[PDB]
Amino acid sequence: SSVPSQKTYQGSYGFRLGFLHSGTAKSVTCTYSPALNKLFCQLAKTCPVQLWVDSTPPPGTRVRAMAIYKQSQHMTEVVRRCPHHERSDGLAPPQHLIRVEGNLRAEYLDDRNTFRHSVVVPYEPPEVGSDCTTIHYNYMCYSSCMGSMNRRPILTIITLEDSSGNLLGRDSFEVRVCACPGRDRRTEEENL
Numbered sequence: 001s002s003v004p005s006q007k008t009y010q011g012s013y014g015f016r017l018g019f020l021h022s023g024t025a026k027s028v029t030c031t032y033s034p035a036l037n038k039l040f041c042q043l044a045k046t047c048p049v050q051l052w053v054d055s056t057p058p059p060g061t062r063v064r065a066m067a068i069y070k071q072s073q074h075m076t077e078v079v080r081r082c083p084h085h086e087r088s089d090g091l092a093p094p095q096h097l098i099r100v101e102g103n104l105r106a107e108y109l110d111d112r113n114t115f116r117h118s119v120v121v122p123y124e125p126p127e128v129g130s131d132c133t134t135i136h137y138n139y140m141c142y143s144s145c146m147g148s149m150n151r152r153p154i155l156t157i158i159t160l161e162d163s164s165g166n167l168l169g170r171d172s173f174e175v176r177v178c179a180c181p182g183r184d185r186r187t188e189e190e191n192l
């Protein structure tokens with residue numbers, strides 16, 4: 001079968017993701033572990049994800065996000081939001097796990113051939129006083145949702161594409177949507 005690639009590719013623009021250095025205090029709502037290349041966040045809350053490039057991509061560039069199951073045995077299964085959480089910013093499809101917060105230009109796709117879900121936004125260069133571009137994502141199911149992930153790990157793949165859909169870059173990270181991201185990250189790093 002065919003599955004979405006997760007191969008890292010910096011490409012022509014030196015594209016890679018970055019995350020805030022948030023730490024693991026109990027007050028955190030989103031925190032990234034570099035050692036595990038894993039983002040820990042709460043249900044539907046803001047997840048800042050940074051786009052870092054070495055040179056500016058051309059006008060019309062787009063940034064797409066898609067989720068896939070991490071385990072080989074579940075990778076051909078389309079990642080969708082569970083029925084419970086499906087049943088709303090009025091822009092995102094109810095069955096999509098990943099939404100973009102704070103961007104009216106977000107476009108959602110149900111692939112006509114693979115049936116996979118993704119959300120894409122226009123790439124914008126860093127604002128004045130910043131060296132990266134930040135997109136706010138929201139995950140609409142817990143890793144534990146029996147009706148969807150059911151504790152099966154998932155990866156978010158972020159791809160940079162030109163206006164015509166050509167691949168410019170790719171990066172990815174595992175994601176755990178949970179009640180206590182700080183505590184969960186700290187505990188998972190204890191195995192190291």
Ligand SMILES: [Ca+2]
Pocket residue numbers: 016017171172
């Ligand atoms: Ca990376």
Ligand SMILES: [Zn+2]
Pocket residue numbers: 081082083084085140141142145147148
């Ligand atoms: Zn759910």
